[PDB]
Amino acid sequence: VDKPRSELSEIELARLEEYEFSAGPLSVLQQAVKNHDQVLINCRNNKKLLARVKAFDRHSNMVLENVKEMWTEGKAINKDRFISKMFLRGDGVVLVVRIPSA
RNA sequence: CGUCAAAGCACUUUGCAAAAGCUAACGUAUCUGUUUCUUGCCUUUUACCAGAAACAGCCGUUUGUAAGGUGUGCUAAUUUGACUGUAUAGUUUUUGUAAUCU
Numbered sequence A: 001v002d003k004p005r006s007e008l009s010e011i012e013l014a015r016l017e018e019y020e021f022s023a024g025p026l027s028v029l030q031q032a033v034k035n036h037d038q039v040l041i042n043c044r045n046n047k048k049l050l051a052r053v054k055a056f057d058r059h060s061n062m063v064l065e066n067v068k069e070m071w072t073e074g075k076a077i078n079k080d081r082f083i084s085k086m087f088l089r090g091d092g093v094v095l096v097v098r099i100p101s102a
Numbered sequence B: 001c002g003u004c005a006a007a008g009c010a011c012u013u014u015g016c017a018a019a020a021g022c023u024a025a026c027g028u029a030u031c032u033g034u035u036u037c038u039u040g041c042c043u044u045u046u047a048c049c050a051g052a053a054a055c056a057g058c059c060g061u062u063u064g065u066a067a068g069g070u071g072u073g074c075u076a077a078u079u080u081g082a083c084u085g086u087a088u089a090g091u092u093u094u095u096g097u098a099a100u101c102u
């Protein structure tokens, strides 16, 4: 769209918001939502998260289900913990990498 | 304008209660009477004359409250009150200079 001017009112701001998804990088969230693809999360405390993604916010606030979360740290020993459902604040997201289900 | 709360609401009839507290129009209006004094005209009384003080009456006004009436509603309408009431990932607070060890 020809409105990245960043000086907008509410309706065109919402249009730009939806375009920020429909073609922006956050577009990866939609096809991950609709294709039910595996997505891995890198948190800012060196945490590894992999799970289904169901909904996301523009802030990258994400609701996850069936999360497998692993962390490593004596001698370096990797450990894992599976939790049913997650609400992760997009503040702490560093990286997302998708594992295609197919 | 917004949110929350409780009250049906608008208009109206009647009863009860109150109306200066920090000197100030309950009424931006305005009458009558009684008692006690001082006066005026006076043959005596009422009826009077015009000033004061202390008291009352009448014509009115405002507010609170209680029970009703009319017209509209409760499948919503209006009124009253309270409120620390609004955006915003791009340096001054809320979308992380973090983890790492000590």
Ligand SMILES: [Mg+2]
Pocket (backbone or CB within 6 Å): none
């Ligand atoms: Mg005689």
